Write an enzyme that holds these catalytic residues in place. Structure first.
Site, PDB file in Angstrom:
ATOM      1  N   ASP B 329     -23.990  53.355  57.848  1.00 49.66           N
ATOM      2  CA  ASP B 329     -23.597  54.619  57.388  1.00 49.66           C
ATOM      3  C   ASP B 329     -22.267  55.044  57.091  1.00 49.66           C
ATOM      4  OD1 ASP B 329     -24.724  57.856  58.054  1.00 49.66           O
ATOM      5  OD2 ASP B 329     -22.612  57.590  58.848  1.00 49.66           O
ATOM      6  N   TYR B 456     -16.227  63.462  55.854  1.00 52.36           N
ATOM      7  CA  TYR B 456     -16.769  64.106  54.789  1.00 52.36           C
ATOM      8  C   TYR B 456     -16.021  65.006  53.784  1.00 52.36           C
ATOM      9  CZ  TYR B 456     -21.072  63.257  57.517  1.00 52.36           C
ATOM     10  OH  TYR B 456     -22.036  62.475  58.091  1.00 52.36           O
ATOM     11  N   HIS B 514     -32.844  56.152  61.026  1.00 50.56           N
ATOM     12  CA  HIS B 514     -31.241  56.266  60.596  1.00 50.56           C
ATOM     13  C   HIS B 514     -30.602  55.354  61.545  1.00 50.56           C
ATOM     14  CE1 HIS B 514     -27.341  57.136  59.190  1.00 50.56           C
ATOM     15  NE2 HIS B 514     -27.156  57.521  60.361  1.00 50.56           N
TER      16      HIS B 514
END
Ligand SMILES: Fc1cccc(-c2cc[nH]n2)c1
Ligand SMILES: Fc1cccc(-c2cc[nH]n2)c1
Ligand SMILES: Fc1cccc(-c2cc[nH]n2)c1
Ligand SMILES: Fc1cccc(-c2cc[nH]n2)c1
Lengths: 537, 537
Positions: B329, B456, B514
């Site tokens: 990730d 982010y 995931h």
């Protein structure tokens, strides 16, 4: 007045350069003069090399572009491999030791130091060689400015203004050393002091003249030390109430350093960077009872059997099948017992000062102390609380009195204590700085002397355990390092070790007192590295 | 009722034994039958082998004694090397996997487990092989009792009473498994349940029958996990206000594991023991903003340029010239940028789920999000404080909602938040235990979600930095691992990677969501180990 020094890498901090290699390759291959040097700089600010140095492309992408440039240059001038030529040129380049020493001395004197270099993003299969060189060098400077990381290249004016911004200094405060005249020009045009480096000696003479600091012909510097706040600190719980702290540096075979009484992992400060640079993964312990390691109060927690079991658990938890064990004083005693009881976990063993003497089953360890007056202080250490009180009274006095060279003795060895007729304010020994004493002072404020003194309170238990090993020999690789002037752990005490360790290797340090590592660090490092490289690799 | 299980090593936990090897050597060398087996046990309780097994002598001292016994036996019965025979016999001995699996299952069910063995102090030059075997095995048991450490040997009655004292159990509560009948006899005479082990399957059938626990033909067990309190914890200050924490296990080439959002070093719990066992030194990070690492509040502290610089500083401080970098990730994103900007420091690179997609210089990262509805949650993460409030509201709910397999979805992806129409009390996923969720809950109580969400909040800065690398290719060894059922980081997003990483290797995991590492740990380990052994060694 100067307060910053900037050094180039190729031709300044690392030799041989590159213009010389291309020149030698041309001569060796009988090619037209300057053919390779010309293909290298083809296109100038628009060429493949500028793109490489700015970080637009990696070295592996630049190789085929350089080959096309070499083809074009040979075509105009009317088994060869650029990869092989550059691989060999990069590999042969070594740190310029006197240049590094001068940079080290300037920084020690308050100068801000930096490396400013035109370099590349190295993605070759052999990139690790260059990575190792850069790592060794950069640790010694305040800043490292690489062209491929900043996207700017010397001689472009922007990189110099960027250099000044980074240094937080006006140009007149900066000395700039470079081997390329064209790259020197903009720093000079800004008003910086510049040095064209051809031969190191002349460059250093110019540097000494402008700084007013002796840099050439200066005494042999001490090995690199450790700044505690800059180290990787490790912590392993070996049992519910016990954790062990260690400092860790380097890669390669694990080397576990075990200090003595009343010391710290920091007693190995001059060995940790040297051993890591030599290709080992160093684990410098805070032994049980010390510094950041746990210090349970019970006497039995410090017998050799339990200390060795915990060091085996330490290896287990870190996932290490073996480590080389190197000990000094009480740590040296622990390492011989690790070799005797856990040979499968000990890759090699080395002791500084501490000899291996087998237990006499016909004599109490107390009776054995009787025979030698130099060990009388061990009887004084027996009664719990007595020596703790004297040693904890004034920490700065305790450490300053203890940590001295052979010619600096301040302590005597009834009606006593260690500090009878000893100064209340001892002078600082030539072996240590005030800063270093204060590190030990700070470490001992956590747990005091109870745990450390308990290492002496297990004589009978240690003797009983040691007698189980009387029919064994130490047959794994072993090194005994004696110190001429240790007046307690005398070199003579090691005289019979070959009887029990037949393949034993030796080292000997002249004019060295008890505190071997800080007394003679250069010699300790030389001895240990030579032995590790031949017996522990 | 049974509550303890004791296993022998030779012939039980490790195969092939030794009576069989001496028997095979006799046959191969056409020697009289039992000649070597007889010389081995010569003198019985008074002989060289008993002294070796009690720890009186080491293996290297026993070799010449065994040779003298072999000479005496050949003399009576009217190029050979004991060293070579025993070196080869020790090396061929491997862990008995189904026996280990049964011991693992009994311990999981509440049984106290122990290894009780007649063994030696190994000081041969090749002792590391045995050290590695013992290390791998012992970690799975409550106790390891070695004859040479206790100075007692099976079949002597004292070692059994010692075994009972260690287990803190009466004999009727103990199952004792051994391949030697003579060594089984005293445990039986004390009232213990005994199993004579010839073939593993029958031994396990007997074990299953007496314990009432299924041990034979049981499902494939999960890889070994990590108990946080049992790991070595490391801490490196990379700058005045920033320290990085990591867990460290094993020796060999450094392998740095980089988790994603909102995870922990613990997300690699099934990989750390496997990779260390495979011969690597694993460094599992708490990424900046997580767990025991520092979490400065400023958005700019979490742009890729600064995170990568700090990981380079981390290597510098640990004295590592390179590490292999493996990311998942956001950690996978960081590893591709480490490969692009610091190839000299990256031995090899691998990403789980995260593809390498070059920056589009003609499109804002915001416009690029526009194109894909699966990334809408990234816009929701932009405004500081909004997602922190929802994610910090109930930690147990946050982690239980997130950490689920592909068929366990509980969350949807306006007028929202992640948890709209999501249960307040989600059921526990088949991927995690309550204990594991509570570890993440406990980690996130220190700094919350601000640092993690800031990863982010650097879209524009990351895009500008990434555009500097558009003319480069990743040419160091690289692995891309796709997960069939990751509905955000879809395998299809990696389709063009070969254009930028021409030598790229691949892995693919079917029925994997995931949370790759905990979803399919066995397959992840298989893929990573195969790749490390071929490309990173
Ligand atoms: F048994 C040992 C072995 C090594 C050092 C010492 C010792 C006593 C004072 N300083 N060092 C004692
Ligand atoms: F340096 C050494 C080496 C071995 C034993 C001793 C010892 C015996 C009694 N006290 N210290 C000191
Ligand atoms: F830019 C990236 C790269 C990799 C993962 C993510 C991400 C967003 C949510 N989970 N993971 C974002
Ligand atoms: F997984 C990836 C890989 C590369 C970019 C992105 C991305 C671009 C905008 N948001 N995330 C996600």
């Amino acid at each position: 007045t100067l307060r910053a020094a900037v050094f180039d890498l190729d031709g300044v901090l690392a030799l041989p350069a590159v213009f010389g290699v291309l020149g030698r390759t041309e001569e060796a291959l009988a090619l037209p003069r300057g053919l390779l040097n010309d293909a290298f700089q083809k296109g100038g600010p628009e060429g493949a090399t500028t793109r490489l140095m700015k970080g637009e492309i990696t070295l592996s992408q630049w190789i085929p572009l350089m080959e096309e440039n070499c083809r074009k240059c040979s075509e105009t001038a009317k088994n060869f491999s650029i990869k092989e030529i550059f691989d060999k040129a990069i590999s042969a380049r070594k740190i310029n030791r006197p240049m590094l020493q001068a940079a080290l001395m300037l920084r020690k004197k308050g100068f801000t130091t930096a490396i400013l270099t035109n370099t590349w993003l190295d993605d070759r299969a052999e990139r690790d060689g260059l990575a190792q060189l850069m790592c060794e060098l950069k640790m010694h400077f305040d800043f490292l400015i690489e062209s491929c990381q900043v996207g700017m290249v010397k001689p472009e004016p922007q990189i110099y203004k960027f250099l000044l911004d980074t240094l937080k200094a006006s140009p007149s405060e900066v000395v700039f050393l470079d081997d390329i005249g064209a790259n020197l020009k903009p720093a000079r045009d800004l008003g910086m002091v510049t040095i064209l480096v051809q031969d190191t000696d002349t460059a250093l003479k110019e540097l000494e003249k402008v700084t007013g600091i002796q840099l050439l012909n200066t005494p042999a510097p001490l090995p690199t030390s450790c700044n505690p706040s800059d180290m990787s600190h490790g912590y392993v719980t070996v049992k519910p109430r016990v954790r062990l702290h260690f400092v860790e540096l380097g890669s390669g075979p694990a080397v576990c350093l075990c200090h003595g009484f009343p010391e710290s992992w920091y007693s190995w400060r001059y060995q940790i960077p040297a051993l890591a640079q030599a290709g080992y993964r160093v684990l410098a312990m805070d032994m049980k009872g010390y510094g950041e390691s746990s210090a349970p109060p019970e006497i039995e927690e410090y017998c050799m059997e339990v200390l060795c079991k915990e060091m085996v658990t330490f290896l287990d938890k870190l996932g290490l099948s073996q480590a080389v064990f190197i000990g000094h004083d009480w740590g040296g005693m622990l390492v011989w017992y690790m070799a005797l009881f856990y040979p499968e976990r000990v890759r090699a063993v080395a002791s500084l000062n501490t000899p291996f003497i087998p237990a006499n089953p016909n004599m109490s360890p107390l009776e054995s102390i009787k025979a030698n007056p130099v060990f009388d202080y061990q009887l004084y250490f027996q009664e719990p609380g007595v020596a703790e009180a004297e040693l904890e009274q004034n920490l700065s006095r305790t450490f300053k009195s203890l940590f001295r060279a052979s010619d600096e003795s301040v302590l005597s060895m009834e009606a006593g204590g260690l500090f009878v007729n000893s100064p209340e304010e001892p002078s600082l020994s030539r072996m240590v700085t005030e800063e270093e004493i204060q590190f030990y002072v700070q470490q001992f404020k956590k747990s005091g002397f109870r745990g450390p003194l308990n290492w002496y309170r297990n004589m009978e238990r240690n003797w009983k355990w040691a007698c189980k090993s009387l029919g064994r020999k130490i047959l794994i690789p072993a090194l005994m390092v004696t110190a001429e002037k240790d007046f307690v752990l005398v070199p003579q005490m090691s005289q019979h070790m070959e009887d029990w360790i037949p393949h034993l290797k030796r080292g000997h340090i002249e004019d060295c007192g008890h505190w071997t590592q800080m007394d003679k660090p250069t010699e300790v490092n030389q001895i240990l590295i030579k032995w590790l490289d031949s017996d522990a690799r």
